[PDB]
């Protein structure tokens, strides 16, 4: 388990959740959102050594493999295992609309 | 849609499914399987430029983002999307057992 509760609380060198703030206007040009002005949809990065939160048997077997054949270029990558929504507030004309965007924020990570 | 049916018929440079044969003993040290002697579990490799098989909205945002700020080092990764099972044959004492290991082979890939 490599989530906010652990990744943030430490200084992990390998696969972990990394904080990142994205401003709707400034970083996506989305001039349609009203609030927030942005959000913390993080990302993942860092090496995936043998047996590090392997996603599937595959992610495991490829793990052991790349461990012995470093120059074969098949090291499982670090990708979001958990994503959470992000309530937003945008206006449709002159009416408040409070919807919930899905798979917007990375809450934890794995080596797939 | 980056599947065998496509990544294998074109010499792709970006994210795509790469072929890989894993011999059970020589590569994994599993002196416990009878047949097969190995199998084609594949892997994924290669850059994930904006607009390239986005697993989620996040992957899209993280793609559209990392493009304008490669310096942050948050480019989404290439990871298995659809995985098929591999049946095997192993012996318990002398009784033969044919079981199907799940999530063992990669058929399609996405950028997460």
């Amino acid at each position, epitope marked *: 388990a490599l989530d906010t509760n652990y990744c943030f609380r430490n200084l992990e060198e390998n696969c972990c959740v990394r904080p990142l703030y994205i401003d709707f206007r400034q970083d*996506l040009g989305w001039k*349609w959102v009203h609030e927030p002005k942005g959000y913390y949809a993080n990302f993942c990065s860092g090496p995936c050594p043998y047996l590090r939160s392997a996603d599937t048997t595959h992610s495991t077997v490829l793990g052991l493999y790349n461990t012995l054949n470093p120059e074969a270029s098949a090291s499982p990558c670090c990708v979001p295992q958990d994503l959470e929504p992000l309530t937003i507030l945008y206006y*449709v004309g002159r009416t408040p609309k409070v919807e919930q965007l899905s798979n917007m924020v990375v809450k934890s990570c794995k080596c797939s | 849609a980056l599947d065998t049916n496509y990544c294998f018929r074109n010499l792709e440079e970006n994210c795509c499914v790469r072929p890989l044969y894993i011999d059970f003993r020589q590569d994994l040290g599993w002196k416990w399987v009878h047949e097969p002697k190995g199998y084609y579990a594949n892997f994924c490799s290669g850059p994930c430029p904006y607009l390239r098989s986005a697993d989620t909205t996040h992957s899209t945002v993280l793609g559209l983002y990392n493009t304008l700020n490669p310096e942050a080092s948050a480019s989404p990764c290439c990871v298995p999307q659809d995985l098929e099972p591999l049946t095997i044959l192993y012996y318990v004492g002398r009784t033969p057992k044919v079981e199907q290991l799940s999530n063992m082979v990669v058929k399609s890939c996405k950028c997460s």
Partner: antibody
Amino acid sequence: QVQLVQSGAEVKKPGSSVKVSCKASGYTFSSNVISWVRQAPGQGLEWMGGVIPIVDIANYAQRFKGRVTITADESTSTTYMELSSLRSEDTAVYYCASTLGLVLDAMDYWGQGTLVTVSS
Amino acid sequence: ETVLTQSPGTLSLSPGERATLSCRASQSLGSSYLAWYQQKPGQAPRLLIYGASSRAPGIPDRFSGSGSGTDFTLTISRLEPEDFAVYYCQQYADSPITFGQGTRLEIKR
């Protein structure tokens, strides 16, 4: 500067469905909500509905609340306006335009248009 | 649901005169939710004014909008020839977006 290129005109049989498309020049597709407005022969403009890119949430004018469908594909960097249960009345010029910023704003960038003719 | 009614139906004027189009909303619009477009025969609409009195990029100075609430007016001070066409008002204060029945400004000769 943003360019919008809709598909070419189309002739259709009543009861069938047409799928027009709008081509966006990449650097502005992900940051612009897109509306679709059609225009009947010698008639006024009718806002049909629209959609926000990436998040893929679209809203349609009640009039087409059940047969129009606007979607986007960032990869193809285009947005599709699929109208089914075609009627003769549906025959008109279907324009696709990007709003200034909000889901319901004025529209500054349009397409060339797309003549969808419904005839037997 | 929200009906815009432009007037006059047709406005024939000579090049140079001051053109004054109107648009009346069934409901109140804010000070910044109406718009003006011009349509040349066989062409997509061209955005002229948004909100109101807010000139869209690249639009000439002679094009000035104004108004609030229910009555809005678009005024072309010195009528050039590439100004005689069709003009529609659009509102975006309350879904659905809605245009006017249009106004035909043509050459008086």
